[PDB]
Amino acid sequence: RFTERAPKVLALAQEEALRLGHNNIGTEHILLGLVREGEGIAAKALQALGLGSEKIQKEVESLIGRGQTIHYTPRAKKVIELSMDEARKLGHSYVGTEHILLGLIREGEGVAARVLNNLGVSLNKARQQVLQLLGS
């Protein structure tokens, strides 16, 4: 149900949660995966918005702090479900990195959203800008 790059986001999200010593894979780890994957549309959008992996990493560690089997948080699961809806609405059968980013922005209320707020990003403006990119 995913593009080639979307599972790489998920792999990195889990790796980051483990590297940071965290107990679950939350929306902020999905955000880290989106930016660190580097090549997908989501990474491109985050780059164009003036963000980068190190800035996001530092803000995650500031807000949450550092700490085997880690599970997705309920909100991260919701974001993944929303990514499927975002893809469908845009005429795609496969969920790409951009749909995970849109699902994260749409949910708009977890640790990733707090991080984005603290990094100076408006979610509503960012949603419009990501869609603008997809329409280009």
Side-chain angles (χ1 to χ4, degrees), residues 14-15 17-18 21-25 69-73:
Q14 186 175 344
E15 182 273 341
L18 290 169
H22 294 157
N23 46 309
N24 302 78
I25 312 162
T69 298
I70 52 170
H71 303 304
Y72 286 111
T73 63

Side-chain angles (χ1 to χ4, degrees), residues 47-53 56-57 59-67 69-72:
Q47 299 154 0
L49 287 166
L51 312 177
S53 299
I56 292 170
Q57 273 261 293
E59 185 53 39
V60 169
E61 298 183 19
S62 177
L63 271 189
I64 303 303
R66 284 191 141 161
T69 298
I70 52 170
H71 303 304
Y72 286 111

